[PDB]
């Protein structure tokens, strides 16, 4: 017997200042946060319909640099899917992606963890990471790549919905 | 790709005057039709969420007594699930159920066709078919039984939703 | 920030066989359960809009009788509000309401716990508890009374929504 | 250009205690009001979909007996459609219906006002107005009749939606 | 009696690679398809509210270059409205528009077929078709012009909804 | 007690041609209006969910230059919140903001009126008002600033929803 909607536990990771919170707040509140208030840990929920199925997204917005690795391991174990976010004007955030990805694979003991690579701030003019390089990296991981802007809303729904679709594929 | 919601083709059958149209119109328009205007053939649509899945119900409301058996065979072949309706104050409509069920099995060439047995007009005081007898009949067919009233709306959503759940079970 | 809908933890209590599960399943699935499958402990969720506010109902469906429990107290203490259910054809279930109310006050350590008194099975002809008696009891507790039928769906939404309104009043 | 949903101004009238408020509160809040708190004047709104069209119902719930005639005239002039409610266990409320209908026609200076006749409290056992008599009355007016219960919710949505359908028909005359 | 939502049969036409599929998938799935998988024929559905009316969009996504004339004629006869798509960085796709428009008018035997002219890929910097020229072309046909991006979602809803509004105008 | 969704009366003001109508039509119809059809007065409605609460937005779209100051005063008195719109490629529309804000404060006799400063046409390349200047102005008023495009839809929902959030904050003071 159906006891209520399917729930998906999504975790947003990536370097400090890439726009993890801004992405999440744009999804939840349709609001662009212009201030940079560094996150410790925040949890959000939203019910959405994706491919005809109603679901409850439970979204954990994480800190760029996480002071306890015990707390990091805990959300990595609990998370069913991960948005790995870099900023397209910050080369270092892009180079950091491989470390977030390795950390997640180690904790989950798997090569095939649902993830989406997200290149955020695509509205800004000062691009330093080429779309082709990000696509190549994503292809090497076997995951989707989506360019986003928390400010214009480009790709924001798509990033979260795509991650849910990755989780569903992995669940069969 | 997901190309849009799942569609379910439902057919409502049963003897003249049992309330096939009234059930359908109550589901679609939240309206009780007090007049008895015999049906030839009418089709209705409604999008609903059942157990977290969005679907489009395509509902064929049939005539009690069908003049062309060619037209009957066509909707029976197209239908994915059947509400077999009798009126709880009309013993003959209940005895007719066996015949509707055999006709559907013959046309679809199957023993295992999604169906729900519906005892309608349960608001009326002159009951001639006992709940126990209908439950026994349904149990003998391996299908659900639901008591309904198109007038009070008791069981109306339940009858259609239960049929969708039967179709989904059969599809795996 | 708003971080997603408000959640309300509702607990359904009352004597064995009064229709606690049937009420809950009618709310969640729009389905009347005719069988009596005794509950140990089950949990349901549903997102609804009540007085213009979207919320997530977390509903705990309990057993009629765990004769001693440390375990019972623990799950009951999660509740923010309680539906106290009796059946209108079972005087003993009505007399038991006093004991469910005392148990709730003890576990929550409070005299003022959000609750609604629910008289279920109002469709049956074998009424033994009068509406006036139940209303008097509810008035003596300072809580709402609602007559329900899990079978006809009378009062089902109203019972749960009323409880949410009681919780909101208590929260201010 | 579409500027937002169509609005329909509905007025609920009828004798004191027939269930006008209980009907309206059942529609708006899915709540049965057991208490009898006589109304002075209350307004409610609800967005609904009727025959595939989204609309905003603005519902005026009136007093059974309206002491000052200026107030009554004002809402009758503003209302686009009227639910005329009686209780099926109260013959006097049923006999009053003709007078509510005449009062509406007088104030609006029209013979053709969208209305629905509503027989409420159909859950109660001591029925004194037969369904056939109400149907005959409604037929004599050329309007729909619906039996309702604010308690069980039978017919509640149907009554309000039917009234919207009557208003739409009148707007394409 | 209203028998369920109004259905609109929409057909998306235009040169190879202009983004017919990408537009449709963005509308249906909120997903940007970065890959170029040439279409043979795909059908999609979505229920939406446009100017307060609920409707069911049935969307036929066509091939740039259609190998069978019999298949082309069939969907052109069935389609109620047409999105004629070009890409704003592809002058040839813009010059092709009048051929798609003539083909539709010939098959439907009408001068007054509901259509919208869509300039897609408006996010790209390498624009070769001026907005003014497209507007002039649309004005010459008496139809709306909309600039879209399947990637950013600019204008995507607007293009489909505008076409529905054109169909509704033609239906009176 | 609950009588239907909460209503918010929003007024969109600012100089001629800044995109007041285009913003509103984008919100209501998901349609970009390319033509410049000067407004006299138009009213729009939309039901939305903001922070889990259902609300009915009643939006008054005003004329850039208002011929009767009696009519201006009336909508300013009725409005609960104001979107003050300039175009980011029109310096003069930005300098005019101060005047719309003063006019609103005068008519409402209050220093603390819910408002959002909206820099529209942010899709255009020919920017003449720097985001820093707009942010400073908004900070000086203690109100939010949002960059919008009626064409791309950037910030459109956010502008209206932010204004509702400002109204709600003011209603709990
Ligand atoms: N222009 C633009 N700015 C953005 C975008 N996303 C984020 N920003 C800006 O970048 C800054 C950082 O955003 P924030 O969401 O706080 O980043 P974060 O990744 O959560 N930081 P942390 O890990 O410290 O919690 C903010 O000032 C924000 O407005 C975007 O897509 N475009
Ligand atoms: N009291 C009551 N009357 C009902 C109920 N369902 C239908 N009716 C009434 O029964 C009569 C016939 O119903 P109808 O829907 O037209 O039956 P049908 O099975 O579609 N007839 P046909 O086969 O001729 O198309 C009508 O007078 C209708 O109002 C119900 O549940 N309760
Ligand atoms: N006629 C009628 N039967 C009801 C109603 N509610 C429940 N029932 C019937 O009563 C029986 C017991 O219902 P159930 O919901 O299992 O009761 P419960 O309170 O959950 N029992 P437990 O405490 O053991 O879990 C079932 O056969 C059910 O169909 C009602 O409103 N009307
Ligand atoms: N059993 C039952 N009781 C009802 C129904 N409708 C209303 N009542 C009861 O009838 C009494 C009066 O209802 P109320 O809605 O206040 O009537 P009203 O027509 O609004 N009165 P007034 O004209 O003074 O404002 C209340 O006790 C209410 O619970 C119904 O459908 N069923
Ligand atoms: N940047 C950008 N790329 C787009 C846009 N729309 C489509 N594309 C890209 O253009 C290519 C072709 O898109 P697709 O939808 O297959 O085009 P099509 O018109 O359906 N091709 P065909 O007629 O072969 O079926 C794809 O690479 C797609 O990513 C857009 O608006 N912006
Ligand atoms: N590129 C672009 N153009 C816009 C935007 N908003 C409005 N416009 C254009 O600017 C012109 C003016 O828009 P309009 O909405 O009529 O402005 P308005 O403030 O209502 N003028 P008025 O006060 O005369 O009623 C129109 O041609 C419109 O297409 C935008 O965000 N981007
Ligand atoms: C240690 N013993 C020697 C003495 C214990 O004596 C008693 C005597 C009476 C009681 C009592 O109040 N009975 C109520 C119980 C407990 O909870 C209930 C909850 C719901 C329904 C019935 C219930 O019955 C409980 C214990
Ligand atoms: C000094 N002021 C407080 C005066 C109040 O003035 C007025 C003036 C007019 C009105 C009015 O339109 N009354 C009729 C009512 C209002 O709501 C309605 C809603 C739905 C249907 C009819 C309605 O008619 C209500 C109040
Ligand atoms: C034995 N069967 C496989 C035969 C079915 O053959 C068919 C079925 C359908 C068609 C047909 O109508 N094609 C055009 C399409 C159908 O769907 C559409 C959806 C939306 C818009 C136009 C549409 O036109 C052509 C042949
Ligand atoms: Mg953060
Ligand atoms: Mg029929
Ligand atoms: Mg149980
Ligand atoms: Mg009243
Ligand atoms: Mg294609
Ligand atoms: Mg204007």
Numbering used by the authors:
A (entry chain C), B (entry chain D), C (entry chain A), E (entry chain F): -3 to 168
D (entry chain B), F (entry chain E): -3 to 169
Article excerpt on this structure:
Here, we employ the intracellular antibody to identify a compound from a chemical fragment library that binds to RAS proteins adjacent to the effector binding region. High-resolution crystal structures show the binding of this compound to mutant RAS, and this structural information facilitates hit to lead development. Our structure-based approach has produced compounds that bind to mutant KRAS with sub-μM affinity that interfere with RAS-effector PPI and endogenous RAS-dependent signalling in human cancer cells, and show a correlation between in vitro binding and potency in the cells. Although, various RAS inhibitors have been described in literature,24–32,47,48, in this paper we describe an approach for the development of RAS-effector inhibitors by combining different elements i.e. (i) the hit identification via a method of intracellular antibody fragment competition; (ii) structure-based design via crystal structures (KRASQ61HGPPNHP) and NMR (waterLOGSY and CPMG); (iii) identification of clear structure-activity relationship (SAR) for the development of potent compounds against KRAS and (iv) the proof of concept in mechanistic and phenotypic cell assays.
The initial hit antibody-derived compound gave us the anchor binding site on KRAS, from which to develop compounds to compete with RAS-effector PPIs. A chemical series was developed and representative structures are shown in Fig. 3a (Abd-4, 5, 6 and 7). In the development of the series, efforts were focussed on the right-hand side (RHS) of the molecule (i.e. substituents of the dioxane), since crystallography consistently showed electron density predominantly around the benzodioxane core. No H-bond interactions were observed between the benzodioxane rings and protein, with only van der Waals contacts with K5, L6, V7, E37, D54, I55, L56, G70, Y71 and T74. Therefore, efforts were directed to substitutions on the left-hand side (LHS), on the benzene ring of the benzodioxane main core, targeting interactions with K5, D54 or S39. An expansion of the interactions is observed when Abd-4 was evolved to Abd-7. The lowest-affinity compounds, Abd-2 and Abd-4, show no effect on cell viability even at the highest doses (these compounds also do not show activity in the RAS biosensor BRET assay).
